[PDB]
Amino acid sequence: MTEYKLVVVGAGGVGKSALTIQLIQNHFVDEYDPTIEDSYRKQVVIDGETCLLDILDTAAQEEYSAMRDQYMRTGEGFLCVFAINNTKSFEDIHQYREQIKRVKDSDDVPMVLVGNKCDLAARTVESRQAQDLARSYGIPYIETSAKTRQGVEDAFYTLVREIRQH
Numbered sequence: 001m002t003e004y005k006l007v008v009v010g011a012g013g014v015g016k017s018a019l020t021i022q023l024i025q026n027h028f029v030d031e032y033d034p035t036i037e038d039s040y041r042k043q044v045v046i047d048g049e050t051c052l053l054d055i056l057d058t059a060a061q062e063e064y065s066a067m068r069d070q071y072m073r074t075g076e077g078f079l080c081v082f083a084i085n086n087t088k089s090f091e092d093i094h095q096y097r098e099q100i101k102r103v104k105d106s107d108d109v110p111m112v113l114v115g116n117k118c119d120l121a122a123r124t125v126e127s128r129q130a131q132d133l134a135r136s137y138g139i140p141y142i143e144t145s146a147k148t149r150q151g152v153e154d155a156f157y158t159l160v161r162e163i164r165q166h
């Protein structure tokens with residue numbers, strides 16, 4: 001059975017944990033320890049193929065733990081997440097991608113840009129800006145809401161489909 005190692009990265013508070021938990025348990029967690037970094041597993045069928053997803057939900061920033069180094073270099077695909085109502089988290093994306101491009105020693109890494117918290121009013125980051133950024137990286141842009149579950153499966157499944165084109 002094919003396994004896909006995914007790594008969720010992004011600034012603190014953007015919803016990396018909420019997105020993962022939504023995908024794994026189908027519920028929205030309002031408060032999940034911001035410091036807990038762990039991997040979760042899920043068997044699913046994508047485009048007729050039964051596969052296992054090994055997802056690392058990252059936490060600490062500027063830190064380098066043993067489990068993350070491995071998943072960072074062994075990670076096959078990355079979900080780069082920012083929040084639609086957090087301009088700084090969006091501006092921060094550049095750093096996360098430069099980071100991945102180094103560890104992978106390549107600018108062609110399976111990746112999906114994710115604009116989360118799309119259930120919230122008065123966004124400060126326009127879909128257009130994110131589309132522009134994703135286009136410059138040559139990757140897809142998908143908006144999600146860990147709260148309503150909108151786009152969550154699309155985000156993770158599209159990343160699996162990107163790992164497949166590699």
Ligand SMILES: Nc1nc2c(ncn2[C@@H]2O[C@H](COP(=O)(O)OP(=O)(O)O)[C@@H](O)[C@H]2O)c(=O)[nH]1
Pocket residue numbers: 010011012013014015016017018019029030031032033034116117118119120144145146147148
């Ligand atoms: N309204 C809304 N809140 C969200 C969403 N995703 C996460 N949150 C909230 O944002 C906060 C941080 O989310 P969390 O998953 O812990 O962030 P992480 O630090 O990136 O793991 C929590 O209070 C969540 O309830 C979303 O899609 N919509």
Ligand SMILES: [Mg+2]
Pocket residue numbers: 016017018032033034035036057058059
């Ligand atoms: Mg978290």
Ligand SMILES: [Mg+2]
Pocket residue numbers: 138139
């Ligand atoms: Mg493509």
